[PDB]
Amino acid sequence: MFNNEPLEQIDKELHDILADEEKRQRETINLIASENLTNGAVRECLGNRVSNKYSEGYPKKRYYGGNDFIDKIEELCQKRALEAFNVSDEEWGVNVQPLSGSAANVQALYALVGVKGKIMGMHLCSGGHLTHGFFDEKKKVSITSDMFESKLYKCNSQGYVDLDAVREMALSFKPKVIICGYTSYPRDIDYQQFRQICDEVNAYLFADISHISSFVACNILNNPFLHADVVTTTTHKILRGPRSALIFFNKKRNPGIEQKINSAVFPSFQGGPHNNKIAAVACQLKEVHSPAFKEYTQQVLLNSKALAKALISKQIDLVTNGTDNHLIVVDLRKFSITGSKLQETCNAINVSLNKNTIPSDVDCVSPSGVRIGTPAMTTRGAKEKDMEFIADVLARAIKITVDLQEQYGKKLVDFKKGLPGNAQLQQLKQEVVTWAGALPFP
Amino acid sequence: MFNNEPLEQIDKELHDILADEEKRQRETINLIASENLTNGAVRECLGNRVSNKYSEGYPKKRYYGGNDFIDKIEELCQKRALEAFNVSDEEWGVNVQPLSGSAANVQALYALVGVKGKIMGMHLCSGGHLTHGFFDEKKKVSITSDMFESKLYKCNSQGYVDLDAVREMALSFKPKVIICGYTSYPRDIDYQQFRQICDEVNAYLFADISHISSFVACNILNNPFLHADVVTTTTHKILRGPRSALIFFNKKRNPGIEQKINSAVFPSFQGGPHNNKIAAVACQLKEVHSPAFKEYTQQVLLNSKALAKALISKQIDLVTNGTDNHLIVVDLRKFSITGSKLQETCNAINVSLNKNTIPSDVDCVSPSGVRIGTPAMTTRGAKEKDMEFIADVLARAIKITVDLQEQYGKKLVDFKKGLPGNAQLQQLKQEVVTWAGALPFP
Ligand SMILES: Cc1[nH]nc2c1[C@](c1cc(-c3ccccc3F)cc(C(F)(F)F)c1)(C(C)C)C(C#N)=C(N)O2
Ligand SMILES: Cc1[nH]nc2c1[C@](c1cc(-c3ccccc3F)cc(C(F)(F)F)c1)(C(C)C)C(C#N)=C(N)O2
Ligand SMILES: Cc1ncc(COP(=O)(O)O)c(CNCC(=O)O)c1O
Ligand SMILES: Cc1ncc(COP(=O)(O)O)c(CNCC(=O)O)c1O
Ligand SMILES: [Cl-]
């Protein structure tokens, strides 16, 4: 007693928009540092009937029976995760149930410190995530600042994490957890120094590596598994999996931590797991542990270095003057245009990027930067040579943005009016669409 | 620079288990009250490239651009939802971002009351959910009992919600929210009476209708939208959607609730939405609002009544002696077997059900019932005639369970030893597999 007609016959209205969405993705230069494109096999898992099953609990500790095949998939996923991140299952545990990055960080934080617990994290404005304790004078913006007591550490004026400030804060604040790994940080992290600071105050070390996870797995960047008690990551960014999260815990360092984490994910926060997510994650973790994926990750870094170097050749300033990873943050102060203005301009030319704060910024309204990344475009086959064109397109959009601002003024409402119909933008979009439309698309 | 091989070529190990899972689903008599089977169209959405997109924020208020088509899908979803639940978009608002039911409840609860906030809900043992404030002497099991202050109200000895007790509790406890709508409750709810109690104490009315959402939408059962401040529901159960949740808020009763609820989902708890989820939900919400789906829902109730009646003709006791909905809870005390033993017996015969508490039960360990539901089997085309056979199968499983307990003893370890190779079970399973295997499968 069901309708088995395909999506196109069943809901033509919805199917058009999805096909529209498909066309926009394939015709866009996607520089969102956190975005990627999943392969058909990962999308087959996400559409699988495994999502039908309710399997509250953990493998071999299910509330319900009929979970034999589900248990194999959840165990296959945990093995592949520990393998991919070069950790021993005797020494490290992992939870595959968190639905997304934010849920996983909140669940993990709760496990470690509990309600009213004290946490330290990097500020959103300096490159931290919302789930790292972010609040504002006006509001406790994140649950992580409301169900926990949070202190926030700023990066220095050159955009690097300033450890002296971190230690100064840890000794005075005395938190139970200190979080590192960030949302818009273009450089590598000194985990060892974090581990040294955490010990002095007897606090846990929490590394959130969602943005750089692939780098850590393939040993191109510093390894937080050597020093951290907990490691969290999403699977949908540089890792190129579905939208999900992973929580790693150091049993050797903290016995009895497995129970706290596992009980935090369920039943403290979540109910039934999403089995299609888990199947999809397993599928990508196998790809992650192949010499080919290491190649791709290497390619992402090469493209990022080349992109940075080309932007600098065109007189564009980058925060910290470059990158050790997949992402770059452009300081736009010399051009006197805001990041929101450039983002608007870039949408008009089918270039996806995001406005981003810089060290000088005092407000999340009017940020002075944009953040770009290479993983999506690297997934689409762009090589080092292709980055000069991306940099050229961005330089042209900056100039166009300056021209329009000269013509209509700094008020964002007035600036947007200049955008529709602009000859140069229509031309620029056209070149963007023609090059973007050509590239391999999973 | 990606691998486009199909799932079978790319991951044969994973692909076999999924086909295994598929075959077990198709060969099982699925009586899990919270389970259903999604159509190909809903799974096409789940596998869609829309999940590649990051769209933090809300429609027309996105952090990033390139969200034109994503915005159409989110607005189309909220529109379709409000229509389905027969509410005016002027009077009610809905949030479509929550990843699952538990997340949605925690988010909604936080919006209304905040940290340390006072809430009241039905106890887990009486048919309430974990997200309704569940705690135990040994620990605060749900975040809802830890981040909030919760009081729990029990049903009476006949299995009915006892309003006198709720009022007694509300006036004494003075919570900001009172929750109704349950995980294992076989009868309808008097929302009006709840609305009265809440007014007496100035508390919000929260209805969780995930198990009965279809009955509320198609108007076979009482409408909580008439009385509640908030309605929450999952989309993966009777509604037949993907795994996701919806949060409804009454704007007329509480202006400025829209912002409180919306900010709670993001950026308080979650980050990026899962667009494939939202797309999937829109697709099912269209089906919900068709006269055909009302027929299916009607059929779920016909099947449930018939099943209760057939169980009773076989001398099996039901909590509240019947049902007003899709679910039944069987009291097993007269047979001196526990729910866990019957669940084990039922997995051996490919009958999916879950152990459940009954009013007499003091502790969650060793519960004296099993909960069954008709939505999955109704989805597979089972009519009222087919229920006598299901009831017959369950009667045989109870008898066999009693015989095995006689042979091997009441200890769970000892009882399970009798299970493998049992001639009657092999026979019952084969009978089960033959009938189940034949039914339509989406
Ligand atoms: C959307 C998002 N999610 N997690 C994040 C952001 C960022 C961000 C967040 C916010 C923000 C502020 C208050 C409340 C909610 C918010 F999302 C404002 C801005 C800004 F300034 F550019 F408008 C940027 C950015 C990557 C998009 C951000 C940055 N920078 C950081 N570090 O982490
Ligand atoms: C798994 C689940 N999720 N939400 C639920 C349950 C139930 C349940 C929950 C628990 C439970 C207890 C402590 C901690 C975590 C738990 F999941 C124990 C039992 C039981 F009785 F079978 F042991 C049953 C049931 C539908 C499966 C339950 C019931 N009854 C209720 N009302 O809501
Ligand atoms: C370090 C980090 N942690 C957690 C999250 C949360 O992931 P979910 O959105 O799946 O909840 C993000 C997302 N960062 C947003 C971006 O970089 O674009 C992140 O950058
Ligand atoms: C009333 C109610 N609310 C929330 C949930 C949880 O939704 P998620 O599992 O998607 O978090 C359930 C599922 N209860 C388990 C069952 O009935 O089988 C429920 O019955
Ligand atoms: Cl999903």
mmCIF file of all heavy atoms in Angstrom, chain B residues 54-88:
data_model
loop_
_atom_site.group_PDB
_atom_site.id
_atom_site.type_symbol
_atom_site.label_atom_id
_atom_site.label_comp_id
_atom_site.label_asym_id
_atom_site.label_seq_id
_atom_site.Cartn_x
_atom_site.Cartn_y
_atom_site.Cartn_z
ATOM 1 N N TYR B 54 26.471 23.391 2.029
ATOM 2 C CA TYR B 54 26.462 23.950 3.383
ATOM 3 C C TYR B 54 25.526 25.166 3.398
ATOM 4 O O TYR B 54 25.772 26.104 2.699
ATOM 5 C CB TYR B 54 27.874 24.409 3.780
ATOM 6 C CG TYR B 54 28.398 23.736 5.012
ATOM 7 C CD1 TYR B 54 29.453 22.821 4.929
ATOM 8 C CD2 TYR B 54 27.817 23.956 6.265
ATOM 9 C CE1 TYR B 54 29.917 22.168 6.053
ATOM 10 C CE2 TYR B 54 28.269 23.289 7.383
ATOM 11 C CZ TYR B 54 29.324 22.395 7.271
ATOM 12 O OH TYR B 54 29.792 21.713 8.372
ATOM 13 N N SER B 55 24.466 25.152 4.190
ATOM 14 C CA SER B 55 23.536 26.278 4.269
ATOM 15 C C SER B 55 23.178 26.647 5.675
ATOM 16 O O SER B 55 22.003 26.700 6.056
ATOM 17 C CB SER B 55 22.249 26.019 3.473
ATOM 18 O OG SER B 55 22.053 24.675 3.132
ATOM 19 N N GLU B 56 24.198 26.932 6.466
ATOM 20 C CA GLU B 56 23.957 27.473 7.790
ATOM 21 C C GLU B 56 23.061 28.695 7.766
ATOM 22 O O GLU B 56 23.285 29.606 7.002
ATOM 23 C CB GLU B 56 25.274 27.807 8.453
ATOM 24 C CG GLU B 56 25.878 26.593 9.151
ATOM 25 C CD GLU B 56 27.359 26.694 9.314
ATOM 26 O OE1 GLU B 56 28.020 26.748 8.278
ATOM 27 O OE2 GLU B 56 27.854 26.755 10.457
ATOM 28 N N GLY B 57 22.058 28.701 8.628
ATOM 29 C CA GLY B 57 21.101 29.792 8.746
ATOM 30 C C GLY B 57 19.730 29.294 8.344
ATOM 31 O O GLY B 57 19.403 28.105 8.518
ATOM 32 N N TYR B 58 18.915 30.206 7.822
ATOM 33 C CA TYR B 58 17.562 29.889 7.364
ATOM 34 C C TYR B 58 17.320 30.511 5.990
ATOM 35 O O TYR B 58 18.113 31.331 5.562
ATOM 36 C CB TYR B 58 16.567 30.356 8.396
ATOM 37 C CG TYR B 58 16.646 29.513 9.606
ATOM 38 C CD1 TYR B 58 17.380 29.932 10.716
ATOM 39 C CD2 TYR B 58 16.035 28.261 9.640
ATOM 40 C CE1 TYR B 58 17.484 29.135 11.842
ATOM 41 C CE2 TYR B 58 16.131 27.445 10.764
ATOM 42 C CZ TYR B 58 16.861 27.893 11.862
ATOM 43 O OH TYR B 58 16.971 27.104 12.975
ATOM 44 N N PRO B 59 16.245 30.098 5.285
ATOM 45 C CA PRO B 59 15.947 30.647 3.944
ATOM 46 C C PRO B 59 15.937 32.191 3.870
ATOM 47 O O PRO B 59 15.344 32.851 4.732
ATOM 48 C CB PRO B 59 14.554 30.088 3.642
ATOM 49 C CG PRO B 59 14.517 28.806 4.403
ATOM 50 C CD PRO B 59 15.228 29.106 5.691
ATOM 51 N N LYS B 60 16.658 32.742 2.897
ATOM 52 C CA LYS B 60 16.806 34.198 2.749
ATOM 53 C C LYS B 60 17.712 34.802 3.830
ATOM 54 O O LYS B 60 17.946 36.002 3.832
ATOM 55 C CB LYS B 60 15.438 34.919 2.746
ATOM 56 C CG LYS B 60 14.573 34.599 1.548
ATOM 57 C CD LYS B 60 13.093 34.725 1.871
ATOM 58 C CE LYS B 60 12.243 34.535 0.619
ATOM 59 N NZ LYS B 60 10.849 34.114 0.933
ATOM 60 N N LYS B 61 18.242 33.973 4.724
ATOM 61 C CA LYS B 61 19.105 34.423 5.834
ATOM 62 C C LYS B 61 20.256 33.423 6.014
ATOM 63 O O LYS B 61 20.606 33.011 7.130
ATOM 64 C CB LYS B 61 18.285 34.609 7.120
ATOM 65 C CG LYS B 61 17.654 35.985 7.239
ATOM 66 C CD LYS B 61 16.591 36.028 8.323
ATOM 67 C CE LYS B 61 15.226 35.638 7.790
ATOM 68 N NZ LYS B 61 14.382 35.032 8.860
ATOM 69 N N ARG B 62 20.835 33.050 4.884
ATOM 70 C CA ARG B 62 21.898 32.069 4.839
ATOM 71 C C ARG B 62 23.194 32.791 5.040
ATOM 72 O O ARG B 62 23.336 33.943 4.616
ATOM 73 C CB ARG B 62 21.901 31.348 3.480
ATOM 74 C CG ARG B 62 21.754 29.838 3.536
ATOM 75 C CD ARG B 62 20.543 29.354 4.301
ATOM 76 N NE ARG B 62 19.672 28.522 3.483
ATOM 77 C CZ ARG B 62 18.771 27.669 3.957
ATOM 78 N NH1 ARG B 62 18.615 27.490 5.258
ATOM 79 N NH2 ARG B 62 18.013 26.991 3.117
ATOM 80 N N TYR B 63 24.142 32.119 5.695
ATOM 81 C CA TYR B 63 25.483 32.648 5.848
ATOM 82 C C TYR B 63 26.160 32.701 4.504
ATOM 83 O O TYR B 63 26.847 33.670 4.212
ATOM 84 C CB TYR B 63 26.303 31.896 6.932
ATOM 85 C CG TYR B 63 26.021 32.528 8.269
ATOM 86 C CD1 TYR B 63 24.949 32.122 9.042
ATOM 87 C CD2 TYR B 63 26.731 33.637 8.676
ATOM 88 C CE1 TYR B 63 24.637 32.766 10.221
ATOM 89 C CE2 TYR B 63 26.419 34.296 9.854
ATOM 90 C CZ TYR B 63 25.378 33.862 10.617
ATOM 91 O OH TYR B 63 25.098 34.517 11.790
ATOM 92 N N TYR B 64 25.963 31.666 3.693
ATOM 93 C CA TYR B 64 26.593 31.570 2.374
ATOM 94 C C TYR B 64 25.574 31.814 1.287
ATOM 95 O O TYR B 64 24.389 31.710 1.527
ATOM 96 C CB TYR B 64 27.177 30.189 2.140
ATOM 97 C CG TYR B 64 28.149 29.722 3.170
ATOM 98 C CD1 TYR B 64 28.365 30.422 4.339
ATOM 99 C CD2 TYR B 64 28.860 28.541 2.981
ATOM 100 C CE1 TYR B 64 29.251 29.974 5.271
ATOM 101 C CE2 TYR B 64 29.764 28.082 3.919
ATOM 102 C CZ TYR B 64 29.951 28.804 5.067
ATOM 103 O OH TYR B 64 30.838 28.363 6.014
ATOM 104 N N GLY B 65 26.053 32.124 0.090
ATOM 105 C CA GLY B 65 25.205 32.264 -1.102
ATOM 106 C C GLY B 65 25.207 30.946 -1.851
ATOM 107 O O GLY B 65 25.687 29.924 -1.335
ATOM 108 N N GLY B 66 24.702 30.967 -3.077
ATOM 109 C CA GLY B 66 24.572 29.752 -3.873
ATOM 110 C C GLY B 66 23.499 28.838 -3.304
ATOM 111 O O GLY B 66 23.468 27.653 -3.601
ATOM 112 N N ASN B 67 22.603 29.419 -2.517
ATOM 113 C CA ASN B 67 21.569 28.700 -1.809
ATOM 114 C C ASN B 67 20.159 28.980 -2.386
ATOM 115 O O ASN B 67 19.139 28.806 -1.702
ATOM 116 C CB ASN B 67 21.651 29.082 -0.318
ATOM 117 C CG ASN B 67 22.641 28.216 0.452
ATOM 118 O OD1 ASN B 67 22.506 27.002 0.466
ATOM 119 N ND2 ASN B 67 23.622 28.830 1.102
ATOM 120 N N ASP B 68 20.091 29.405 -3.646
ATOM 121 C CA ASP B 68 18.804 29.725 -4.252
ATOM 122 C C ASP B 68 17.898 28.498 -4.329
ATOM 123 O O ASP B 68 16.766 28.537 -3.869
ATOM 124 C CB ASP B 68 19.016 30.338 -5.643
ATOM 125 C CG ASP B 68 19.556 31.780 -5.581
ATOM 126 O OD1 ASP B 68 19.127 32.552 -4.680
ATOM 127 O OD2 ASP B 68 20.397 32.137 -6.448
ATOM 128 N N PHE B 69 18.417 27.403 -4.857
ATOM 129 C CA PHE B 69 17.649 26.164 -4.970
ATOM 130 C C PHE B 69 17.424 25.469 -3.636
ATOM 131 O O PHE B 69 16.341 24.957 -3.392
ATOM 132 C CB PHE B 69 18.290 25.251 -6.013
ATOM 133 C CG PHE B 69 18.546 25.962 -7.306
ATOM 134 C CD1 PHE B 69 19.838 26.220 -7.742
ATOM 135 C CD2 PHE B 69 17.480 26.474 -8.032
ATOM 136 C CE1 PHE B 69 20.061 26.921 -8.919
ATOM 137 C CE2 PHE B 69 17.693 27.193 -9.197
ATOM 138 C CZ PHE B 69 18.988 27.411 -9.648
ATOM 139 N N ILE B 70 18.437 25.496 -2.762
ATOM 140 C CA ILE B 70 18.297 25.004 -1.376
ATOM 141 C C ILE B 70 17.202 25.768 -0.636
ATOM 142 O O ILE B 70 16.377 25.168 0.060
ATOM 143 C CB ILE B 70 19.614 25.119 -0.567
ATOM 144 C CG1 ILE B 70 20.755 24.356 -1.232
ATOM 145 C CG2 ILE B 70 19.437 24.596 0.845
ATOM 146 C CD1 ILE B 70 20.443 22.919 -1.532
ATOM 147 N N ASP B 71 17.186 27.087 -0.792
ATOM 148 C CA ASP B 71 16.106 27.906 -0.231
ATOM 149 C C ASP B 71 14.720 27.520 -0.733
ATOM 150 O O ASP B 71 13.755 27.515 0.035
ATOM 151 C CB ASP B 71 16.333 29.388 -0.510
ATOM 152 C CG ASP B 71 17.223 30.023 0.509
ATOM 153 O OD1 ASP B 71 18.374 29.581 0.662
ATOM 154 O OD2 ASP B 71 16.765 30.953 1.178
ATOM 155 N N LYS B 72 14.600 27.199 -2.016
ATOM 156 C CA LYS B 72 13.293 26.761 -2.513
ATOM 157 C C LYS B 72 12.873 25.449 -1.831
ATOM 158 O O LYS B 72 11.721 25.296 -1.436
ATOM 159 C CB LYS B 72 13.302 26.577 -4.018
ATOM 160 C CG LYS B 72 13.353 27.856 -4.841
ATOM 161 C CD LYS B 72 12.530 27.682 -6.125
ATOM 162 C CE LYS B 72 13.272 28.104 -7.386
ATOM 163 N NZ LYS B 72 13.556 29.568 -7.389
ATOM 164 N N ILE B 73 13.820 24.527 -1.654
ATOM 165 C CA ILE B 73 13.509 23.241 -1.044
ATOM 166 C C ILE B 73 13.119 23.408 0.420
ATOM 167 O O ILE B 73 12.125 22.803 0.851
ATOM 168 C CB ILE B 73 14.647 22.235 -1.143
ATOM 169 C CG1 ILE B 73 15.060 21.988 -2.591
ATOM 170 C CG2 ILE B 73 14.221 20.906 -0.534
ATOM 171 C CD1 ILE B 73 16.499 21.570 -2.705
ATOM 172 N N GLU B 74 13.828 24.253 1.170
ATOM 173 C CA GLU B 74 13.467 24.432 2.577
ATOM 174 C C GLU B 74 12.098 25.067 2.754
ATOM 175 O O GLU B 74 11.327 24.619 3.602
ATOM 176 C CB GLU B 74 14.547 25.155 3.394
ATOM 177 C CG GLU B 74 14.346 24.999 4.897
ATOM 178 C CD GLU B 74 15.488 25.491 5.754
ATOM 179 O OE1 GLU B 74 16.605 25.638 5.237
ATOM 180 O OE2 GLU B 74 15.289 25.721 6.964
ATOM 181 N N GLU B 75 11.771 26.075 1.939
ATOM 182 C CA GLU B 75 10.447 26.766 2.005
ATOM 183 C C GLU B 75 9.331 25.847 1.535
ATOM 184 O O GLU B 75 8.266 25.788 2.142
ATOM 185 C CB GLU B 75 10.461 28.087 1.210
ATOM 186 C CG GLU B 75 11.388 29.129 1.839
ATOM 187 C CD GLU B 75 11.623 30.364 0.976
ATOM 188 O OE1 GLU B 75 11.785 30.241 -0.269
ATOM 189 O OE2 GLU B 75 11.672 31.469 1.569
ATOM 190 N N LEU B 76 9.597 25.102 0.472
ATOM 191 C CA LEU B 76 8.641 24.086 0.011
ATOM 192 C C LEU B 76 8.344 23.007 1.067
ATOM 193 O O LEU B 76 7.220 22.511 1.138
ATOM 194 C CB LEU B 76 9.123 23.408 -1.279
ATOM 195 C CG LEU B 76 8.090 22.466 -1.914
ATOM 196 C CD1 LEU B 76 6.715 23.098 -2.099
ATOM 197 C CD2 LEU B 76 8.610 21.983 -3.242
ATOM 198 N N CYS B 77 9.352 22.667 1.883
ATOM 199 C CA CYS B 77 9.195 21.705 2.971
ATOM 200 C C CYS B 77 8.341 22.249 4.102
ATOM 201 O O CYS B 77 7.456 21.567 4.591
ATOM 202 C CB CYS B 77 10.577 21.288 3.497
ATOM 203 S SG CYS B 77 10.548 19.839 4.565
ATOM 204 N N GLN B 78 8.600 23.480 4.516
ATOM 205 C CA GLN B 78 7.873 24.086 5.656
ATOM 206 C C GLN B 78 6.413 24.363 5.266
ATOM 207 O O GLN B 78 5.496 24.241 6.079
ATOM 208 C CB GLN B 78 8.495 25.414 6.093
ATOM 209 C CG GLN B 78 10.007 25.450 6.146
ATOM 210 C CD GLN B 78 10.534 26.849 6.343
ATOM 211 O OE1 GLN B 78 11.182 27.408 5.468
ATOM 212 N NE2 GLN B 78 10.263 27.423 7.502
ATOM 213 N N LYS B 79 6.224 24.768 4.015
ATOM 214 C CA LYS B 79 4.895 24.973 3.459
ATOM 215 C C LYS B 79 4.133 23.637 3.483
ATOM 216 O O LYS B 79 3.070 23.530 4.100
ATOM 217 C CB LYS B 79 5.019 25.557 2.031
ATOM 218 C CG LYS B 79 3.722 25.647 1.243
ATOM 219 C CD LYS B 79 3.972 26.148 -0.162
ATOM 220 C CE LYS B 79 2.713 26.023 -1.008
ATOM 221 N NZ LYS B 79 2.979 25.352 -2.318
ATOM 222 N N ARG B 80 4.712 22.616 2.848
ATOM 223 C CA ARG B 80 4.086 21.277 2.774
ATOM 224 C C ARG B 80 3.758 20.682 4.134
ATOM 225 O O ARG B 80 2.762 19.986 4.270
ATOM 226 C CB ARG B 80 4.950 20.309 1.987
ATOM 227 C CG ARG B 80 4.755 20.416 0.493
ATOM 228 C CD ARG B 80 5.645 19.445 -0.252
ATOM 229 N NE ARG B 80 5.582 19.665 -1.693
ATOM 230 C CZ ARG B 80 6.326 19.022 -2.600
ATOM 231 N NH1 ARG B 80 7.204 18.093 -2.234
ATOM 232 N NH2 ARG B 80 6.196 19.306 -3.899
ATOM 233 N N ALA B 81 4.576 20.989 5.136
ATOM 234 C CA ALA B 81 4.396 20.476 6.491
ATOM 235 C C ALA B 81 3.218 21.107 7.175
ATOM 236 O O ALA B 81 2.457 20.431 7.874
ATOM 237 C CB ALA B 81 5.651 20.723 7.331
ATOM 238 N N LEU B 82 3.108 22.418 7.022
ATOM 239 C CA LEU B 82 2.022 23.184 7.630
ATOM 240 C C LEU B 82 0.679 22.784 7.004
ATOM 241 O O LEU B 82 -0.312 22.565 7.709
ATOM 242 C CB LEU B 82 2.304 24.685 7.507
ATOM 243 C CG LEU B 82 3.526 25.140 8.338
ATOM 244 C CD1 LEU B 82 4.117 26.451 7.835
ATOM 245 C CD2 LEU B 82 3.212 25.247 9.817
ATOM 246 N N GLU B 83 0.669 22.623 5.689
ATOM 247 C CA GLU B 83 -0.507 22.110 5.004
ATOM 248 C C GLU B 83 -0.916 20.733 5.553
ATOM 249 O O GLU B 83 -2.093 20.493 5.853
ATOM 250 C CB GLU B 83 -0.245 22.040 3.497
ATOM 251 C CG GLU B 83 -1.316 21.314 2.706
ATOM 252 C CD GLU B 83 -1.184 21.528 1.216
ATOM 253 O OE1 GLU B 83 -0.222 20.998 0.608
ATOM 254 O OE2 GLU B 83 -2.068 22.214 0.651
ATOM 255 N N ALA B 84 0.063 19.840 5.696
ATOM 256 C CA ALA B 84 -0.200 18.440 6.058
ATOM 257 C C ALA B 84 -0.812 18.346 7.429
ATOM 258 O O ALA B 84 -1.733 17.565 7.648
ATOM 259 C CB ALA B 84 1.067 17.604 5.986
ATOM 260 N N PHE B 85 -0.321 19.176 8.338
ATOM 261 C CA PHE B 85 -0.832 19.212 9.697
ATOM 262 C C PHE B 85 -1.954 20.218 9.903
ATOM 263 O O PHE B 85 -2.301 20.529 11.041
ATOM 264 C CB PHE B 85 0.316 19.384 10.690
ATOM 265 C CG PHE B 85 1.108 18.132 10.863
ATOM 266 C CD1 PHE B 85 2.261 17.900 10.111
ATOM 267 C CD2 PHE B 85 0.660 17.139 11.721
ATOM 268 C CE1 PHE B 85 2.975 16.711 10.258
ATOM 269 C CE2 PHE B 85 1.363 15.950 11.868
ATOM 270 C CZ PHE B 85 2.515 15.733 11.136
ATOM 271 N N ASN B 86 -2.546 20.669 8.792
ATOM 272 C CA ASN B 86 -3.752 21.502 8.804
ATOM 273 C C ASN B 86 -3.653 22.721 9.712
ATOM 274 O O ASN B 86 -4.454 22.889 10.629
ATOM 275 C CB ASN B 86 -4.987 20.678 9.204
ATOM 276 C CG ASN B 86 -4.966 19.293 8.635
ATOM 277 O OD1 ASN B 86 -4.997 19.111 7.422
ATOM 278 N ND2 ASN B 86 -4.895 18.292 9.522
ATOM 279 N N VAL B 87 -2.646 23.545 9.465
ATOM 280 C CA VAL B 87 -2.423 24.742 10.261
ATOM 281 C C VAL B 87 -2.124 25.869 9.300
ATOM 282 O O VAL B 87 -1.572 25.648 8.210
ATOM 283 C CB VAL B 87 -1.258 24.592 11.271
ATOM 284 C CG1 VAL B 87 -1.730 23.871 12.519
ATOM 285 C CG2 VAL B 87 -0.072 23.880 10.630
ATOM 286 N N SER B 88 -2.499 27.076 9.716
ATOM 287 C CA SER B 88 -2.292 28.271 8.904
ATOM 288 C C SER B 88 -0.859 28.733 9.083
ATOM 289 O O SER B 88 -0.400 28.829 10.203
ATOM 290 C CB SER B 88 -3.271 29.382 9.326
ATOM 291 O OG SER B 88 -3.129 30.529 8.502
#
